[PDB]
Design a binder for this molecule. Sequence first.
Ligand SMILES: [Cl-]
Ligand SMILES: [Cl-]
Ligand SMILES: [Cl-]
Ligand SMILES: [Cl-]
Ligand SMILES: [Cl-]
Ligand SMILES: [Cl-]
Lengths: 327, 327, 327, 327, 327, 327
Amino acid sequence: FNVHNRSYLTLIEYTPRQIRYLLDLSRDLKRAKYAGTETPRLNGKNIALIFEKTSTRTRCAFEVAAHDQGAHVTYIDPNQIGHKESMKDTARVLGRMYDAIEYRGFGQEIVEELAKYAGVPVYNGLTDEFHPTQMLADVLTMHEFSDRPIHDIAYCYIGDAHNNTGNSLMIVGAKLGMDVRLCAPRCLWPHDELIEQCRAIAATTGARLTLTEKPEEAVKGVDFIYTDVWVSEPFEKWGARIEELLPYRVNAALLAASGNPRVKFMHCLPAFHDSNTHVGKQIADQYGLPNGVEVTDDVFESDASIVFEQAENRLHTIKAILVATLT
Amino acid sequence: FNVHNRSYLTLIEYTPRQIRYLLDLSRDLKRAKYAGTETPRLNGKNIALIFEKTSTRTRCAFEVAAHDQGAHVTYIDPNQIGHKESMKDTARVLGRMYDAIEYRGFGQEIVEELAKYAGVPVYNGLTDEFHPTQMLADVLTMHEFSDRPIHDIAYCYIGDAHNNTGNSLMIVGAKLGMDVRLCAPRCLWPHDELIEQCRAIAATTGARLTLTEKPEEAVKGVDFIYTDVWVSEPFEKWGARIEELLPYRVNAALLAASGNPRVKFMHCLPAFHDSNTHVGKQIADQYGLPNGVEVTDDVFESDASIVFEQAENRLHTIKAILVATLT
Amino acid sequence: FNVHNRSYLTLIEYTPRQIRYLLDLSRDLKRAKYAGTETPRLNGKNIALIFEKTSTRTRCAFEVAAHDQGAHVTYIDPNQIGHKESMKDTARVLGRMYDAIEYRGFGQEIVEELAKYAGVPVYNGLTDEFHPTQMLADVLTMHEFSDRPIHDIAYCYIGDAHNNTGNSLMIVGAKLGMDVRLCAPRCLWPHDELIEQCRAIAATTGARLTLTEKPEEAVKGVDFIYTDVWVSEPFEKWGARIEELLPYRVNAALLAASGNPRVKFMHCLPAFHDSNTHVGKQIADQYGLPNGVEVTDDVFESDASIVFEQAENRLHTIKAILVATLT
Amino acid sequence: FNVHNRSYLTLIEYTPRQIRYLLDLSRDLKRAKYAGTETPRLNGKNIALIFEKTSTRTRCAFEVAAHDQGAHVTYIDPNQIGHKESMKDTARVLGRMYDAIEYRGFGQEIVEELAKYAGVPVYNGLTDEFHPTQMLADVLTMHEFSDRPIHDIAYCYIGDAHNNTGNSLMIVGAKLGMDVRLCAPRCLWPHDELIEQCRAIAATTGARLTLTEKPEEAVKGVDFIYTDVWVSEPFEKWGARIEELLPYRVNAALLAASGNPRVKFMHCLPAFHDSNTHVGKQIADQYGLPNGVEVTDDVFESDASIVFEQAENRLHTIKAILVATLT
Amino acid sequence: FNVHNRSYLTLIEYTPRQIRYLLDLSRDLKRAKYAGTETPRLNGKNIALIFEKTSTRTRCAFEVAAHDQGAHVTYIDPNQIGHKESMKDTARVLGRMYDAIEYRGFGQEIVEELAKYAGVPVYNGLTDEFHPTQMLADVLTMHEFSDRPIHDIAYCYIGDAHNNTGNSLMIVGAKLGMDVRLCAPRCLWPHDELIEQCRAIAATTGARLTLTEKPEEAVKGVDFIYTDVWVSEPFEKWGARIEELLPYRVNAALLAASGNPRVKFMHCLPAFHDSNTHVGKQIADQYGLPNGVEVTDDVFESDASIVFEQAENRLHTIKAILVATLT
Amino acid sequence: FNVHNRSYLTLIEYTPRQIRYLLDLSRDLKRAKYAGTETPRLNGKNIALIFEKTSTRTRCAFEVAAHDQGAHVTYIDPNQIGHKESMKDTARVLGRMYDAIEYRGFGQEIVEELAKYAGVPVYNGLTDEFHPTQMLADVLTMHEFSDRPIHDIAYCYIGDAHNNTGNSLMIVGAKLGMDVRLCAPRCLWPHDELIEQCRAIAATTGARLTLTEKPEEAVKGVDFIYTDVWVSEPFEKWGARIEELLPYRVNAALLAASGNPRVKFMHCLPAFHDSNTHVGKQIADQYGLPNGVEVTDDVFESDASIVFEQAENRLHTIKAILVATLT
Ligand SMILES: [Cl-]
Ligand SMILES: [Cl-]
Ligand SMILES: [Cl-]
Ligand SMILES: [Cl-]
Ligand SMILES: [Cl-]
Ligand SMILES: [Cl-]
């Protein structure tokens, strides 16, 4: 019962042993779903889903995972917590009605208060600082597409690194002993406090945390290249960060710069890889990036891309979290 | 397995044999629900419901039908696909999480791309061009209220005919060999390309497709008179189309003009038949139509009206679609 | 089958015998949920939930209660009935698809029309005049925290008394013979018509209905003190009613004025007891009430407060309503 | 839930839409029993059966129908309600123990009081005025043996027409729009009050109610000829009514007088068609009618007779009533 | 297993501890039936029901209780044990076929012989001396309508006290320590032998057994007033006992004589409270008691009357007896 | 399927092979009931029980056997077939409602007509000529109390031999090859036609049928002595037959006359063995037979008596008949 009745706010609060137990559980549940061996063990359990920010992958992953294990789910639309009722008051009411709460919002303060007073497991769909449910899916995808042990895998996240995606990517790789590389301008590196935490963790696990501004050096010898949108947010901010992050675009030459023909590409999504989105065409017109913003359409649709296999693993990893905490 | 694992985008892609198989299935499932013989055969199946346009009849029909067969359902509120994430990207993620997708939106292009990349059955709740789920419910209702074969039934749709409702009403009647009549100004006839497709279909099935501008001639000898709202859309457009469609109002004299005392009245809904709706009173005040816009309150509430029996059959027909494609 | 197949619009339409049957049923279902003896008896039943006003306690109570008894539920977001489709038309469509309807909106006229034409049980989550689902939870909470019979319990609601919360609190206490006290300015007393109805009811049950403007006299000898927000509504109205209701604030001295060390405090929620809500800080800044608007933070968080036990009983009482009307 | 939780006292209180829903339900349940698709949906439900008059068809139909749907049944033998305990008192005790009551007795007053105070659905096995459970079976039998719509069917009841059998036969045919003919002496016509009710109903449904004294005119063009025993009752009354009803005997010439070789014969039973019953031989000896009283043995045993198919449909129609009111 | 495999002939053979265990069990089973938590634990068990005297409440209570716990039941109509076959012989045959026997007859000798030789539990529906199944229902009803402990409850039975109803009412109250009062002429007091048994029992339990001829003194301070019919029996005997029992009629003044506004009224039933019964009008005509014999119609139908809640508790108490002896 | 879908009217229509198959089946079902291995295989099957004559053993045996195999049963009280409705008409209605019919009446003609027209298996509880269900129980009892093969068993029936009990006892023993002896006055021997049938059967099976008037010779060497009541019937007939049957009384000396200390005694019941029955005392008073009519109380209650084990086997043998014909 190491993970029994535990909240899932960030992987910092988890040991490597526990993280790899959740990766193994996600593997077995994914296989059980395909093979038909899956048996529901959360029958009649209700899970509230706070979603102050919109979501497609995380919401659906929670709903289907829940239904596969016999649980029900209540989806709370953004259409306003903290406006008429405090987070502390809301936590103490949902905790007496629901067996678990998921929270997709703004501050780690908010979800930490939710966990403090809820009295039931609380999960972090995404905050401004961390995004741990995504990290479980990412490592599972890398393991599936890797012939080697998890601690021998190397990967480079490139782009806005001080956002929640880069923060948790640093944590997970340091936890599991793998070779992590964050590549970005020093303006967009994670806060030095968090970097220092992960340097200490890497000492105890053999992980190789490196932060650099030079892309061609960050991708050399990696198995996977990772990127995310450069803005979470007003349109005007795009102009500022496009100047900073222009050399960090993920194109065919970048994957070639790794020197690894087996290298794959990952993206937590949503992604701007073409001009077939409303805001995507707004960036392509004013700033002249028609065939992708942070990744080329070619790279995104190439055989090296595994972004959709990564997206599907959100279902199985979140399902593992539900089973490990409620059973 | 003629209909096994098939998308339902429009009835053009369906043979008459398949359409009547779905009508028969809707009849048996409707009877099984009342009699208690219904047995769930979609247990644990998840269905995503894209709803970019609001809906009461279609959403509820999907939810209850799904729950009656043991399936679950995720309702995606309008509150924005195509804004941050492309339809192609969304299709490839939901297709790995859900057993089927429903789409209620704008363009047949959108739902056709959804079907192309989803990898799972995709259903069309409504597009701007077609509305095939409604057509199945309409024909089932006519068959129930008809003592004669489906190919002997006659019906006239009157009003805005180039919208999705008139388009699919032309298709279904041509498929099933029945006597179809669209009555409207030539400004509001369906595009000649679609008319010509249905003329060709009617040749092979014995259907009698006729398009006319004269109401008293379109209703003579029909078993059912059909109408829909004249605007889908800004308020200002009402003034233009009210002038065009004023003589096409459905009143007691019109049903009398059919010459059939057994004639019934149908409406896909929502309908403006009185001044008890917010926009309905706005039309009644400025344009002076207090007792109904496209149909009189008397006609709508008369014993000849079967609009609510038609609405209920949405549950059973959609249920037939779910069973025939997922089983 | 006294309560079989009955709508739940207000407790005026219910006898004391029936109300206490629902309180007893809520007690047994609450105990059955904890003890594991609960057995689902609403399997496959669908319940539509109209929510024109936002809700946390009522929506979740319906969802979880429904799922505990094996029923499904469709949550209709505010994002507009009565705009394009009348309430009468909507009732006749949902009544053929759903086994029951809940309505959370504005006027008793709206939910009464829903019950008239739906053909299935209709429940009142909240209207402007009544809020009967809350009343069942309140009396259950008082009974649990009372060593004495229900008809011997005394309680005082203080604040805006002509709102839906004070109206139904008058009704329920008069029905059950208990000592009821509404304390407010005469401007904010319930309409004299409703007061006179409850005076007549109190004659037949032994209830002691008293309405007063003096707080220290209304709380003397009561077991529970009750309060609610002073505005449902624009911000500007707060200034007017804060002047009226300033002496009716619930502070430590008020509970002391009861003279009962066992006295408890209740609140239907949401509540403004601190400056940790968006609108709550707006009131605290302009009007200078930092530690609570209608109740002190101390009182709200004191051991005397039972507001969260009251909130949880919404699940069990609503569950009792579902079982008693659908079984 | 049009028929949910409703008593079944006479078809006057039922709309045509509801009656045809019960005919459809009887058809589906009859087919489900043969095909094996029937699934019990009344498990654990108890039904009391008041039988102040003896019964074979109605009692057994209730018992087997109940057992097929998983319900139990308590048969109260004639061996005396209203002797030591009032009907009102009995209703309020059985209503708290049983989910439904059936009543086979004397006056519509008795069963109407039972329904008033029972609090649960009450069914009328037979009263002196009406016999609605039989009517459902009769129309189902006619529909099965008719190639044409129900409203096009013609039938003639001949014999004692002011009894319960003729009364309800007038009601049902008027409800369903069919061509009804009662043939009897004016002494034995139904009360003019009831005739006038059914004339008004026939106006709104297209039914053709005709009452005549001439047999050869009443049977011309009918699909079914119906008859019943001429006395319910002392033996002495037979002499009086045999003189009146002698020309109304159902013999081979009468069916020939219809002019329809497809014509069938119906009888609610019990029937005196031979001298193989104790009272049947008493009539045959004194009054000299050896080969049948109201119908010839030849006609009763001819291929045109469908009285036993009619008797079997009592099971399926009563079963439909149980399902439609208790589910 | 204190009550396991035990016959239920009279409460004299039961300790107070066992009686209150059966009252508690009846409470839990009554609540389990309403709440849906009831689970059958007598599946496939057969219970023979000897009924030499007619019965409505006891027969139905046995049938429905049995069916609720999954047992079956065989109802033996009065239409003669002891005529061709002895009770001893019958007991030894039914004991090898049935899991339990109920007996409703004449002498305690008969049911005691049944228990002696049956080899299975035997229950006493009613004898001339005792009626213990009724007593369990009566005490349960008093407890439900009492805010105080069972041993503090006071009640007065008034009328024919030496019948089976008064005899067992004396026993049960003495067993449970409550304040019992039998009020009747000394001609109709129970036999002194039984009175002396209950005086001895009352010594060990604190019960206050008092027998008096003065009504106004017997009702002072009681919570419940109880009465029964004055004859079980020829019509001629009514004249004799009406003279004796005229001052013991239960009217509004009598309940007022208790001095307790909370006082309730009870009656095992059947009751003569109006002229709407065959024998009831015979008494009203000859003896001039039109508005009730032993209780006024006003009192019987007043809010103080709880006779029907008492009747319903026959189901739950008998059910408790079945469960406690067969499980 | 030798016995599949077959009526059971008399054992004459059954081969020895089939009879011993039913004896074996009764043995296995009796053992399965005690051991808990019994599994219901008649679920949902309805069995009508015509009982024109009263019955305790046969009715209960049918009810409990039916319920043990999951079947239901409808008990038709004597309170008149053949009075208003012919047997042929009744058979054709019950055959379409019930899976089987039992008949307990007067003439083999009646039950043979029932089987002819019913269309479903018909069983003979008892007629005036035969009583085959009893015979199966009798042989099973003899086999259980016999260490030797069935064809080596010897038994003597003594008393009124031309009744149904003696008739079928002759048939069964002749079928199974056992040594049968009927002992009675020649006035009360079975009809010579039936005797001659059984002599022919005994030739083919080795049975030893002997009819004698001398008791001491009929009992010599038998394993079982059998007797039944001397009148089925007015009281006056007893005087006539008591004179005839006085020397045929079953007393201790008679069992001694067999010369077999292991000899047992059997009686189909009801039996007059003492003065503890209403009619039994009438015979004892007028005719002076206080300690038994056809058997002494001593013999009936002696250890040699096995009448109650014989009675219990009615359940298991009838159960075998139900299983062998309906499965
Ligand atoms: Cl490129
Ligand atoms: Cl009009
Ligand atoms: Cl304070
Ligand atoms: Cl003829
Ligand atoms: Cl009075
Ligand atoms: Cl002897």
